[PDB]
Amino acid sequence: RGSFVEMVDNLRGKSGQGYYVEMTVGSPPQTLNILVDTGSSNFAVGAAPHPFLHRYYQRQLSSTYRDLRKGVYVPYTQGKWEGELGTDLVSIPHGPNVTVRANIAAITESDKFFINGSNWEGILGLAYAEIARPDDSLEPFFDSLVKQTHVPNLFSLQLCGSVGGSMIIGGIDHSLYTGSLWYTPIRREWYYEVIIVRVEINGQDLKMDCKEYNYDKSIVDSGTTNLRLPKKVFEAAVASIKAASSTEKFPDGFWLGEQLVCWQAPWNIFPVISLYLMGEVTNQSFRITILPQQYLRPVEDVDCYKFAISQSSTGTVMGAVIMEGFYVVFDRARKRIGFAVSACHVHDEFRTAAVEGPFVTLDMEDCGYN
Numbered sequence: 001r002g003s004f005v006e007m008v009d010n011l012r013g014k015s016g017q018g019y020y021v022e023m024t025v026g027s028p029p030q031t032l033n034i035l036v037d038t039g040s041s042n043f044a045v046g047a048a049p050h051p052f053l054h055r056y057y058q059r060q061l062s063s064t065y066r067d068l069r070k071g072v073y074v075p076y077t078q079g080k081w082e083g084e085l086g087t088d089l090v091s092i093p094h095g096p097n098v099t100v101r102a103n104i105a106a107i108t109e110s111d112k113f114f115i116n117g118s119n120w121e122g123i124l125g126l127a128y129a130e131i132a133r134p135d136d137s138l139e140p141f142f143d144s145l146v147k148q149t150h151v152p153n154l155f156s157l158q159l160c161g162s163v164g165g166s167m168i169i170g171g172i173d174h175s176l177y178t179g180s181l182w183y184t185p186i187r188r189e190w191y192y193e194v195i196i197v198r199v200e201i202n203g204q205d206l207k208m209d210c211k212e213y214n215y216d217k218s219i220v221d222s223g224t225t226n227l228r229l230p231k232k233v234f235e236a237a238v239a240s241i242k243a244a245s246s247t248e249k250f251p252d253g254f255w256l257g258e259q260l261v262c263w264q265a266p267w268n269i270f271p272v273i274s275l276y277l278m279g280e281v282t283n284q285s286f287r288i289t290i291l292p293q294q295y296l297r298p299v300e301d302v303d304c305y306k307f308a309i310s311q312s313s314t315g316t317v318m319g320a321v322i323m324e325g326f327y328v329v330f331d332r333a334r335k336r337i338g339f340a341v342s343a344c345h346v347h348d349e350f351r352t353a354a355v356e357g358p359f360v361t362l363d364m365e366d367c368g369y370n
């Protein structure tokens, strides 16, 4: 409890390609790099020699593999994968000293799923059974870990924007953040769904019915890059950031993530974004504040950055954009998610990402969409 030195720095990544942890499956152990995705609930690994993959799961080499005789077909807006369901033994070498029998979906066909040039070969869906595919009886990796071992029912993520970071499984490591953690309730255990109760651009309120911030849900999702906002909130949000910084002009396509923008070797013009989240106590909220350093993402394989806030029709998505400013504690045993200022967040001399409270916010339960 409090000190997990072996788990510190166990995530790697390339900017734009996500964060992965090293995992082993089968006996003898097969080492795979696996994408950490708090917005899905399947443990799904390449199992066939797709050209983009460094390595894949070879079930034939595993004496402990058990076939479930059941296929799965998983489409996404862009992307699909199909595979064969089975169970095998799984450990995390830079995670707790335990081995579990987990469901694995061996991906045998995929389209637009794997990234050419990336160093991961599968995805670790850390959310709940309710969105597992094919259905909610396929118990996710984390539920099996907690059922079969003494690991507490929580994990925390420090995503440092070559990227790196830490996934602490079973606890919190205090060296990873400063100040205090503040907690928002998980509204329903499917996605890691939370409730946003107010949004401020450079300390001015968007002044929207708060139901708009969570239409139709808000989630914390390490497997998406952007801060994604409901169309109507997105519209209000760029309008406000345009006005805050209109000392310089940008092509309009920039704000739609349709073209990049460039200086040489200009942060003080861009405002901070505050999201207030529902607190633990009636009428109490807290707020997280992100810097332009989080929402203007550097692009290499071209000083050119992309606007990393985008419109959505699936609700607000607090992606890696947001998470990279914070230590984020997925406190599943108490159905709550904690934020604190990350000890590794990208910043400067003028302002810093922040987590502040308490605030008085009334009618917070109205902000949820039904």
Ligand SMILES: C[C@@]1(c2cc(NC(=O)c3ccc(C#N)cn3)ccc2F)C[C@H](C(F)(F)F)OC(N)=N1
Pocket: 016, 017, 018, 019, 035, 037, 038, 039, 040, 076, 077, 079, 113, 123, 221, 222, 223, 224, 225, 320, 321
């Ligand atoms: C199951 C899914 C998924 C994520 C990724 N993620 C990445 O490729 C990636 C890339 C960059 C970064 C960063 N930073 C993070 N993740 C790739 C494939 C995929 F199917 C798709 C699902 C969706 F809603 F999209 F369907 O969103 C989430 N949460 N996970």
Ligand code: NA
Pocket: 145, 146, 147, 148, 149, 150, 151
């Ligand atoms: Na247990």
Ligand code: NA
Pocket: 174, 175, 176, 177, 178, 179
């Ligand atoms: Na600390």
